[PDB]
Structure formats: structure tokens, C-alpha cells
Write a protein that binds this ligand. Structure first.
Ligand SMILES: O=C(NO)c1ccc(-c2[nH]c3ccccc3[n+]3cccc2-3)cc1
Lengths: 112, 115
């Protein structure tokens, strides 16, 4: 059940990597919807947040902490929006869990 | 007054009413008063963290717990077709209350971009 995000983690295709550790990867979105638009993904293949396990909690929190640290480092001092999409109604484009982080512009309401 | 005195702190302490979905020792899930989708609820920590930008490293498991509770709640509410989770930070993010909150929206097709 491989995805393009699997290929990015395995370094088989190019991505502009912002941050990496032993358990996650942050990289700029190829189809950016704001001046800054990046993704934070687990290296573990969790297909969708709906199937995340209880013992994934820390890992999921880690994505958010890394995301907020990356945002600060990228100069997003007026704020930002974090997004996780699930399933068809959520508009989940890739069946590998991913945290979007968008900023550098006013984000509007509703959030889609 | 633990929880702070944002509206969310008052909800945690049952000083202001809310439509509560789920509660444990770490968090509270309740319906949003100005819903942007057929289902729209919030998951908040009971610990007052003002915004994600000031979360501590040791808040990781708590932040994770918000998402796990969010996904469980979405399932329990019958959002079978999916949903969108949102955290807003600061002015550009449209953050309305300075107590960290995970929005969970579903029951309709969500569009792109997410605002
Ligand atoms: O000024 C605001 N937004 O721009 C604002 C933000 C939050 C509340 C608010 N949100 C609630 C969400 C869920 C349940 C109860 C809520 N609530 C009660 C009183 C204010 C308020 C009201 C206004």
C-alpha cells in the first residue's frame, strides 16, 4: 500500500526537506496553497488518522510539535493553520497521515 | 480556577454550558456554537495552553491525545465519509480563543484550500 510519501521518506524522489528526525519528516508541499505550505509526516505508515492506534498518540503529537517549530524557523510570526484531512469528505489526497501547515497569508473561515 | 478564564476554561469548569461529546482527565470534546459544517466540534486540553506556538515539548502526548479523541468522536458521531481537523494559530490562522483547540468538521464535502 505504498504512496508517494513513502517514496519521499525513502529518498527515492525529490522533496524540499525542511526537517527530519528518526520518526518524522517535514517538507514543502508540491502544490502550495499559501506562501508557506509544508507537510509533517510520520515515517511509520499510518494510512489515515481514523486508523491511528492509541499508542500512536505521542507520535501524532510529535508531528504537531515539529510543525510548530518548523513554522517558527520559517518566520511564520503572524500565525498559521494546521490541517489533517481524513477520507473523501476531508479531501485526504494521500493515504499516508500528513499534517499540513499553511501561513504567510490570512487564512479564511470556513476552513474549506 | 484551573483551565484559565477564556470561555474554554469556563466550559471546562462547567461555569458556562456546552454540548459535551466526550470528557476525560486530559481533554473535553464539545460542539462548536458557530458550526461551519453539519458536524463541527472542538477538542481542547483541560491544561491551559494558550496556542500551539507556545506548547512545550512535554505536551506532545497531550496534543496527540486531542487527535485520537477527535478521531474517536468523529467515528462515534457517524462521520463515515471523513472529516477535517484544524488547529488555528494567531492572527493569520484566525485563532478566536487563546486556549488550544482542535476543530473537527464533517458531514459535507470539505473544499481546498482549507481557507
Ligand atoms: O469571538 C469569537 N470568534 O471570532 C468567539 C469565539 C468563541 C466563542 C464561543 N465559542 C464556543 C464554542 C463552543 C461552545 C461554546 C462557545 N461559547 C460560549 C460563549 C462564547 C463561546 C464565541 C465567540
Amino acid at each position: 500500500g505504498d504512496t508517494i510519501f513513502g517514496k519521499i521518506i525513502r529518498k527515492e524522489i525529490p522533496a524540499k526537506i525542511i526537517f527530519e528526525d528518526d520518526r518524522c519528516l517535514a517538507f514543502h508541499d508540491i502544490s502550495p496553497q499559501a506562501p508557506t505550505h509544508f507537510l509533517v509526516i510520520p515515517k511509520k505508515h499510518i494510512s489515515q488518522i481514523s486508523v491511528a492506534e492509541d499508542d500512536d498518540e505521542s507520535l501524532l503529537g510529535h508531528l504537531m510539535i515539529v510543525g510548530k517549530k518548523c513554522a517558527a524557523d520559517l518566520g511564520l510570526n503572524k500565525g498559521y493553520r494546521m490541517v489533517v484531512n481524513e477520507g473523501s469528505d476531508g479531501g485526504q489526497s494521500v493515504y499516508h497521515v500528513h499534517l499540513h501547515v499553511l501561513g504567510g497569508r490570512q487564512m479564511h473561515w470556513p476552513p474549506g
